[PDB]
Design an enzyme around this catalytic site. Structure first.
Site, PDB file in Angstrom:
ATOM      1  N   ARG B  65      28.331  55.491  24.349  1.00  0.00           N
ATOM      2  CA  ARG B  65      29.178  56.659  24.605  1.00  0.00           C
ATOM      3  C   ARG B  65      29.208  57.656  23.450  1.00  0.00           C
ATOM      4  O   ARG B  65      29.499  58.838  23.638  1.00  0.00           O
ATOM      5  CB  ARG B  65      30.580  56.245  25.053  1.00  0.00           C
ATOM      6  CG  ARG B  65      30.542  55.565  26.414  1.00  0.00           C
ATOM      7  CD  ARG B  65      31.876  55.567  27.134  1.00  0.00           C
ATOM      8  NE  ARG B  65      32.962  55.008  26.340  1.00  0.00           N
ATOM      9  CZ  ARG B  65      33.451  53.777  26.476  1.00  0.00           C
ATOM     10  NH1 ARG B  65      32.918  52.934  27.350  1.00  0.00           N
ATOM     11  NH2 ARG B  65      34.474  53.394  25.726  1.00  0.00           N
ATOM     12  N   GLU B 102      25.375  42.863  18.734  1.00  0.00           N
ATOM     13  CA  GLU B 102      24.655  43.351  17.570  1.00  0.00           C
ATOM     14  C   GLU B 102      24.184  44.793  17.733  1.00  0.00           C
ATOM     15  O   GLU B 102      23.689  45.179  18.792  1.00  0.00           O
ATOM     16  CB  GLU B 102      23.459  42.440  17.257  1.00  0.00           C
ATOM     17  CG  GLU B 102      23.859  41.080  16.701  1.00  0.00           C
ATOM     18  CD  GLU B 102      22.701  40.115  16.559  1.00  0.00           C
ATOM     19  OE1 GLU B 102      22.825  39.159  15.765  1.00  0.00           O
ATOM     20  OE2 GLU B 102      21.682  40.288  17.243  1.00  0.00           O
TER      21      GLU B 102
END
Ligand SMILES: Nc1ncnc2c1ncn2[C@@H]1O[C@H](COP(=O)(O)O)[C@@H](O)[C@H]1O
Ligand SMILES: Nc1ncnc2c1ncn2[C@@H]1O[C@H](COP(=O)(O)O)[C@@H](O)[C@H]1O
Lengths: 178, 173
Positions: B65, B102
């Site tokens: 985002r 990760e």
């Protein structure tokens, strides 16, 4: 086209990623060079304005690399940008569609209120390969009764025949590689 | 401020998503309203110019985002945008950092000493932004600040990033 050259010079090609024989086309340097990014957005926006005039209502950006281009393209055209995401990420009522990705399946999703029936959209992603991802996005949009005017990308891998997969929805790319 | 109001009016909240307890803050309507998007980018850009002058070399956008805001913010500032991605997505030599998942960055994304501002849509626990800062620090880049549209203050992400400065347009508990 000097502008197109500014984009082409900033595509970095990595052999054997992620699997032997595949050539990965990395658009990262386009984002890192402000002149290159501006050129890419400008070329896409000129093409879309020349092709569709005032018919476009929204840009739809595809998760995740389409997100890098959708909002800037939409802004350049004076339009909003709607999102098509990997399933599980969006809140509220949604539609989802399954497609083939590599050896398995993946799912895309859109909020039911992203578009109203009759609204016209152009879908953007960074690169068109098999066309599976873009085709699923088109299917989802069609289920909201939106009209998909065109799909666009920076890069198209022509030997994979993505263009044919999307027909009869038009497709346009800035650059093409086998 | 009418501009900040243009952004605030376009944040939609969803109780108990994605699981019971969480109140999801959805920025989607900001993207859909071109005026709201322009206001958000402008507010962030004005803050960063007023705070750092010409010292920023790059914006770093966080997958996924943050990708929605990074390039437009970079463009408004006349800068390039570098990418920090979920692991497994980037070609070439990479570094990665876990957090409670990760993130990863190309080893050649930045040169030592280059100054960067990190952007994501929302700061919560600060785990994601902290991993991004760690990666950039391992490239010897200097993180000048992290920014977002939304900050959930009860989760104390700002304290987690200290001493790196943080700025948000809007705050909710
Ligand atoms: N050779 C490639 N280099 C970079 N990205 C690719 C490549 N092939 C496929 N993709 C990505 O995979 C998705 C499109 O694949 P497809 O659904 O086969 O058209 C997009 O997210 C592309 O960014
Ligand atoms: N309540 C929330 N609403 C929307 N997004 C959230 C929320 N909490 C966390 N996030 C997302 O998760 C990441 C921030 O989580 P954190 O690592 O805890 O700061 C960002 O990528 C946000 O987009």
């Amino acid at each position: 086209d000097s502008e197109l050259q500014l984009v082409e010079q900033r595509i970095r090609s990595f052999p054997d990623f992620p699997t032997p024989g595949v050539v990965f086309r990395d658009i990262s340097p386009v984002l890192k060079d402000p002149a290159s990014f501006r050129a890419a957005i400008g070329l896409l926006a000129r093409h879309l304005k020349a092709t569709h005039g005032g018919r476009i209502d929204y840009i739809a950006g595809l998760d995740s690399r389409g997100f890098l281009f959708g909002p800037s393209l939409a802004q350049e055209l004076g339009l909003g940008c709607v999102l098509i995401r990997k399933r599980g990420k969006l809140p509220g009522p949604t539609l989802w569609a399954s497609y083939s990705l590599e050896y398995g399946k993946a799912e895309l999703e859109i909020q039911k209120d992203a578009l109203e029936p009759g609204q016209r959209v152009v879908v953007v992603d960074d690169l068109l390969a098999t066309g599976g991802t873009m085709n699923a996005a088109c299917e989802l949009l069609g289920r909201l009764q939106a009209e998909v005017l065109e799909c666009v990308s920076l890069v198209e891998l022509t030997s994979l025949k993505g263009r044919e997969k999307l027909a009869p929805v038009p497709f346009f790319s800035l650059l093409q590689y086998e």
